Amino acid sequence: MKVRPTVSSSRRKARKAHFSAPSSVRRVIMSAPLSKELREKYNVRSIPIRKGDEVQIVRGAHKDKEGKVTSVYRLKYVIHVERVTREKATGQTVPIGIHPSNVVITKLHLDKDRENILARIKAGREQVAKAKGK
Amino acid sequence: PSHKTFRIKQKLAKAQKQNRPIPQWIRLRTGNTIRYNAKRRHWRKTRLGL
């Protein structure tokens, strides 16, 4: 249950914020879990998804399909996975939009920025665990 | 009339430039709801007030 006066449990406000969030907020909204191996390696549970990540689909009709994230369409709150596609009437191939929360990240695109992120998350989680274990 | 002021001529220019159908690629955008130009004006239908 919410307590803080700054937090609001209004369904209307929550939906408005979600569906009119700017691109930077949509980045955080479109987070995906890490695989078990990456989670053990980095002590990080979830991260915002990025183009060039390798993911495995764990929900929907395309379960168990793996591939590289080729586009993160924030405007449509979906991602595009390599070879996870569909055919139009003309036979032309179009990507299928997958929500990032329906996939798991099996391999991460890592550059100092993507990593300062992981170090911050790991340090925060470790500190919180230590403080709770005091 | 042939005799026009610059202000009147400028406003006629603006009306002429606004008198057009909407671009086709607009209707292909995600979340688009514009079907047609709803503010279209014709010299025989609706009189513009100068």
Binding site: - | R7, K11, G49, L50
Partner: protein, 86 residues
């Protein structure tokens, strides 16, 4: 009167006002029927709430007035973030 007299309608009582843009500037009186130009004060009456709200603040761009709340929130500060190029 009626149809035959409507054919003599080829003059203009009102032209375009420079202040409000409406075709309400009386061409002979040189006074705007809407905004009261050229009087300094904008014409406004309490018996027309609709007319008041058609031109109250917020119905236009608010080119300058929309930036005041942010400057107030930050305290009308000056200068640059400690450590800025330039």
């Amino acid at each position: 009167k009626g149809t035959s007299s409507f054919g003599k309608r080829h003059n203009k009582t009102h032209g375009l006002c420079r202040r409000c843009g409406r075709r309400s500037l009386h061409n002979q009186k040189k006074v705007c029927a809407s905004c009261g130009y050229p009087a300094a004060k904008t014409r406004k009456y309490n018996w027309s709430e609709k007319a008041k709200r058609r031109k109250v603040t917020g119905t236009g761009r608010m080119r300058y007035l929309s930036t005041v709340p942010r400057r107030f929130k930050n305290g009308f500060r000056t200068g640059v973030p400690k450590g800025a190029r330039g």
